[PDB]
Design an enzyme around this catalytic site. Structure first.
Site, PDB file in Angstrom:
ATOM      1  CB  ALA A   9      -0.921   0.004   1.212  1.00 14.74           C
ATOM      2  CB  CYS A  10       3.851   2.188  -0.997  1.00 11.11           C
ATOM      3  SG  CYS A  10       5.112   3.392  -1.472  1.00 11.11           S
ATOM      4  CG  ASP A  11      -0.144   6.135  -4.274  1.00 12.85           C
ATOM      5  OD1 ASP A  11      -0.904   5.149  -4.475  1.00 12.85           O
ATOM      6  OD2 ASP A  11      -0.626   7.187  -3.851  1.00 12.85           O
TER       7      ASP A  11
END
Length: 114
Positions: A9-11
């Site tokens: 969950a990291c752009d």
């Protein structure tokens, strides 16, 4: 074997994985939320890139540290911080064999893999 280190969950991770996946690069994913990290990795990455490059000092997790924890940093101290709190490691790290890339610069990915 190429190995990508980070979290889901990291752009930045999403961007980098889209690049890799679209270029049909096979890689293993080392997920800090699933398996943690160890000092052996951190020492190697810092040797190659410098602790200021590997440690995400701009990020929220580092911002929140206490005064004593941020003082007079050097490689050894930075490694201890990242070991306990992998959220502080810059994302991604991509292991290419003889070397690694820290962060996602599409031109560097292209130079390495295209």
């Amino acid at each position: 074997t190429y190995v990508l280190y980070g979290i889901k969950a990291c752009d930045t991770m999403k961007k980098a994985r889209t690049w890799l996946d679209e270029h049909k690069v096979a890689y293993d994913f080392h997920d800090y939320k699933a398996v943690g990290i160890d000092r052996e990795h951190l020492r190697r990455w810092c040797a190659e890139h410098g602790w200021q490059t590997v440690l995400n000092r701009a990020g929220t997790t580092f911002r929140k540290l206490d005064e004593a924890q941020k003082a007079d940093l050097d490689e050894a101290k930075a490694i201890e911080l990242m070991l306990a709190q992998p959220s502080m490691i810059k994302r991604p790290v991509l292991e290419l064999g003889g070397r690694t890339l820290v962060g996602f610069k599409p031109d560097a990915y292209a130079a390495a893999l295209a």
